[model samples]
Target chain A: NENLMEQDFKVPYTDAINIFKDKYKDADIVDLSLERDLNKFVYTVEGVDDNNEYKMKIDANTKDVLEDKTEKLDSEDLNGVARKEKLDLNDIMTPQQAMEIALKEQNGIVKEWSLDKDLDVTFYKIRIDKDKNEYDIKVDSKKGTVLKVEKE
Target chain B: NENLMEQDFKVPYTDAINIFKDKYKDADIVDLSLERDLNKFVYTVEGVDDNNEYKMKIDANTKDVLEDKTEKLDSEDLNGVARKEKLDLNDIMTPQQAMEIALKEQNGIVKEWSLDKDLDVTFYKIRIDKDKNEYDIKVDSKKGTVLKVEKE
Candidate 1:
């Protein structure tokens, strides 16, 4: 529904291509195009990072990384379910630290956070014991606010 | 092909019977029995909470309302649309409250609230504006929680 060649290409393909190639020599630049309506250049970046498959998106205008958006591309299923809903990168902390906090929770625990649940960004599900004690536990990959945690 | 008894019934007939009875006043107490695994039960609860009528549970073993818990029923469906997936009652807030709070956050105001969605719950779809920033909000009926509100 959109055309790329007609776009102003935001920062210009040359600028984006240059910065991309200069900083990351490993990216398999599958496609690079500008979204005129979105007013940004989109790059379909793929390759390996830290010995693991990765994908990334960067805003052409801001040159800001949109997301790590890492994913594996070798599978036939396309959606290999290697990710969950979404996550807040800023919430990242040492697993040990998170575990300590969770253990202090009344009925919280670390569970097998499936990759099928995470969609937009990297995320892992953790269980929180409801005050009702119904295990109304949820799998949340979209956020990391934990809302509220307490012993009482 | 599914059996008529099971097809017409809901999961955990114990709860269904309660719900049906609470909604229906004169419903004939018919034969109430749990199918093989208790996935469902036949009940005849007679009453009417709203315009539509309801039936009663006729199970011989089913007892009177010895332990009845009343709250919003199956509110999630009527709560909000399934967009971001998952529901958090924490977002629920009063209509005026949600609109006021959302506008405080620079989102728009309450628009189409008081709109019934499901069960006894009414969903108010609202619109708000702050500093030219607009938002769409949905608030619960009874609890008045921000079932789900978002901005563009």
Candidate 2:
């Protein structure tokens, strides 16, 4: 009877924003987009840090900040996000990391889902093909993966 | 830092469970291992109308549930439950019905996932093997089409 999937992490909206502000205190958010089209009612955030504008995606309902663009971050290909600087998925791709990265990548609510492709083990090298294609990324889920995607 | 995922859907725990029970009313959910195994927990569900026992695997963190022995229930397979019972995707054939039927069928979650497949724009016809060997499942945001799955 329930066609909805709701959850509460209790991290608080303030906490989400605070963490972003504190971590990227040096930079300013430039733009934020949430909905499908740029014109849709989405969370469009923007800031500038040291002449570098930052952009990120935030959960409208949960206020959880995600997909923040940075000035000097790893690059990305059609397959995945490339290793750029400080950290990458190789060092720390936990749920938290996935959530943060997902919002940055997908730019919206972090929907929880999994595909049981390999029947052998559980330690999977996670990747997302938003455009539906071949492998283009090689993130190890153990890095400081940041996308603080500043548009301006 | 948290290994657990932070998904906030609109549905609650009881609601999610009820969806399963409503479809497989004859199916008995003997136990629910929510906290013990975050990666993949066991659900011993038995059919109430029959002596069929189903051990379902649900990635509590990912919300990707599968029959201990499963198959895909797409437009090709939805017939098993929908055709005979006059079920509708949005109104009648709920997720629970889809899940239970998938667990009961051969080419349901297990098979499609084994193939690592996904259906195209077809809403209910996407019980196919997705890309990436099943680390993540994709769904049509508007129609909820399953993209891929992680079967282990």
Candidate 3:
């Protein structure tokens, strides 16, 4: 049996949330979670403040802020956000552009999408529903190239 | 940027946890999360009741309990548990046995693990640490056979 829900394993999630709120009272926390990545425990905080969506990362062990940035949440919210490593906003195409490309490429309704990186490549996984069939499309983030397409 | 902590696009994660608790009042929920798999939105609830650990799955839209079973919760508490489809206790090796085999193969301590299924085959993703080195080991869940190992 596995109990991945080990209690008191790291910094309390509630404590992390309180710390985050104490620092950013303007933020309306949309989501908060604790997870380990790259040999470190992290608290992922996302919320809206002053008409903008923001994402932040904090080290659980050291309570040091690792990342603080604004995020664009659109199609990625359809199904759920896909969590992948090494995503950079300045290095890749905007999700809006990706959505436009995917829509033009497949003439269907956009159902789901998320930017992800694997094998050192960043891409968008977009799903489109059309004419009783579903399509899975991948677009390279840096080049805006259609990487793969599968119709279901 | 990667917004893995995308907030409340589908449903409030709180609702999922509350519903789970409403149904399983005996479970002292240690962790609850919302994740997407293929076409389904699932809430993976891990907790303890009476004397045993348990993991349960509930669909987000239908609120149907898809899975309810006792689970092992030893060394798998580090990394997020890997959830897959079609796992049956009667047909798989216990996580303890898989962890023992992994430890023997690597002579290290376990950091995390989860019994998962892929391509109609059951396996365990066991992470081990030894001598300042970390290993990701994959073992067949049915036979306790070491399938793959990688150092990082």
Candidate 4:
């Protein structure tokens, strides 16, 4: 089942990231996730630059930008902007690398994974399913360390 | 301006947490933030129980539940559920404690703050504005450790 989903996506996740970065040169991506929408899988990438935050949805198979949005930052959004400044897409680990570390800690089928920064720490949060139980693993993007593991 | 905003809220932040906990016995709050909406400061709290995730808005002065919502967990939401399992409302540090630590690190007017669990680590994310610069600080909710600090 895991390999089935991987085979379904013609474009690599990195390519999707690059596609988004290519358009928003100054934006720093803060979140990315592969989700099933209708009958297709799509990648939702979110980023923030100095003045605004951007969210773009790209078709997984076509590698086409499906939707693009930008929201201006106000005083209420300044903190999020400060947090975004700490993240440079060029400096962090890739989602693939973080997933490998998570799978190493808990062997299971990857259900969903996302790259996000919380509290200035950039990490990949992966969810795996095994024997009807769910495992959540967080891997630090810079150090490649498993920051947390929880089973439920 | 910092103390002015603090004085405007009648209900303490801790009380709001308890109010949410008292209603949903099994819910583990993953995110809590105080924001100004329509000239009134309200507390927005989100939590996840075993079967469903919840969001509630409470009036800062009257302590009334302004909005209550729950969404059933599907396969797509399981990752978030697994992540929620790692958080316990009773085990982590209070928002007050986390805010104090952040204030000690950077003196400014706290624009906004939130408590959330990302990847199994529960931390308080605080945003402060000093002069024209904004500071984002993440404090470990368990050990009182400063996880990250960024200025922009």
Candidate 5:
């Protein structure tokens, strides 16, 4: 396991993380990690930008941001979900935009956001934490509409 | 990009490739490669066993098979889709079992198989190759039912 960790990343974490920070300057990173696929090392950084939650992948070796894969995270469940059709990549709103819209009604620091879907519904679940209390907010990824809010 | 091939599997390809042969003895591996995720290096071997296309992941260092992630290929397109509910891991059929059922309805060697889904369906996409032509077959993951079949 130690050797495998050593094996995957040709570029140091310092190098990869810096690339992520530079590419997503307007966002706040919650979690970032490295992945291996197609014989290449990729760093996936997940964070929230002004209008939506976004995931960006940087080629660890080349230190370049991969395109079209910088996904908008759904507000409901942070993990991905079921979908009947391909995501309309161009129309997604940023998590910060979603947060700014949500803050008009309520306020907190953006803590968690997830993309979730049911048979007919596709939405984002955004959580704002203020003073140790958690607030659950749902925003439609497609329409950028606030669906519900609850304190948990 | 070329430096990737220069990287060696610390566990050695022979040691890792043999593990695939031992476990799924019925499979005919078409591709085997190394990848890294989180804290471990993995050997991902892709091939067909009896009736379905299969992919397996092995820990490069410990040589242990990881859990239920061995996926069957989706024949239509390699991209994965949405699911209806949590996959019933306890009551799912083996890839070989799914293949045997599929072979009864179609004819050819099972070239590839993958687990795929949409909001309305969760199924296996099994690819059959005969005389260089490809056939796409769908088998339900939970119930072992044949959803549909087409030529591609």
Candidate 6:
């Protein structure tokens, strides 16, 4: 069973992230999620640049570009994009690492997750789902500290 | 975004369980997980009977059976299966509940989880992943109390 699980996805999670970065060179990744579509797994990667927000759905096994889209940033979107530009991917934890910190503080599978900045502090906002209860956890992207945990 | 999330799956989690139980009448469910396949969500349900182990992948939106398979239980498999039969799903907390209890005591996303009986007590055994750290937490299924925690 463990071996089967390992083989379920031919592409590693990090490789999937790299695949997205290779396309959107200037965009800062803000969100990433893995989900099963029908017969294969896909990584929904979202990022933002100074002028636009980008979303890409990459096949987990074949590394195929299932979908690619871009939208011009509005005022609200630009505010988020500006914060995203301040982040140095090298200085902050990966979404996977931030997720671990959140899971340690709260329980459940990740329903959706994204990186965001508030009051000058960048953090990973992770939404967790466990039955009917939903938890929102924020972890400091650079320090690896859990900033907040809220049940909704 | 939240509204879209709610509309992503038409069937509730409990309904999915009922759909599985409707087919495997006498089997005791040991594990259940949700994952994305291609364009839809799927519930991979596994259960054990006195003679066999059953696995079914059901669609989350339409509750359609995507796949089904059964295997005769061997001596080792029966040992686990026999323990599963001892559990009373009604008397025990759901895996989601147990996961919350585990998260309160430890930390990480549940990599895998199961229900088992040891020394006449049924407990939810959950494996959590946090970057490089893996933690195992055992919570009493009936009491909703954590029984053991181990790092691996």
Highest DockQ scorer: 5
lDDT of 6 by residue, B1-152 (tens): 21122234676556867877888898887666665565667777777777677777777788766656555566576655453554445666766777788878977676556666677777878777777998989999889878899989
lDDT per residue for candidate 5 within B1-152, as digits (tens), equals 11222233457545755776676676555554454556566666655543345556667677755521233334442333211222333365655676678788887777555555555455767777667687878888788889999989
lDDT of 4 at B48: 75
Q: Write model 2 residue lDDT over A125-144, tens digit each, in one string.
A: 22333333322222223443
Q: DockQ for each candidate? A: 0.01, 0.01, 0.01, 0.02, 0.03, 0.01
True contacts kept of each: 0.00, 0.00, 0.00, 0.00, 0.00, 0.00
**Which candidate comes out best when scored by lDDT?**
4
For candidate 1 chain B, the 10 contiguous residues with the lowest summed lDDT are: B64-73
What does candidate 2's lDDT look like per residue over B56-116, in tens digits?
4443334444333222233342433322322122232333333334333323232221111
Worst 10 residues of 3 chain A by lDDT: A1-10
lDDT of 1 by residue, B1-152 (tens): 22221133324434644555454443322222222224322333332221222223333234322111112113242233221222222244433454454445444333222233544344545555445565666666446566665765
lDDT of 5 by residue, A7-72 (tens): 534565456556655766765555544545565666666555544455566676776555212333
Q: Candidate 5 iRMS, in Å?
A: 12.4
Q: Cα miss at B57, model 1 (Å)?
A: 48
Ranked candidates, highest lDDT first: 4, 6, 3, 5, 1, 2
Model 6 regions more than 4 Å off? A1-10, A35-40, A75-87, A94-96, B1-152
lDDT of each: 0.37, 0.33, 0.60, 0.74, 0.57, 0.70
Ranking 1 against 3 by TM-score, winner? 3
Model 3 alpha-carbon drift over 4 Å, by segment: A1-152, B1-84
Per-residue lDDT of A79-119 in model 6, one digit per residue for the tens?
55443444334577766777778777877677556666667
TM-score of chain B of each: 0.28, 0.29, 0.45, 0.78, 0.45, 0.66
User: CA shift at A68, candidate 3, in angstroms?
Assistant: 26
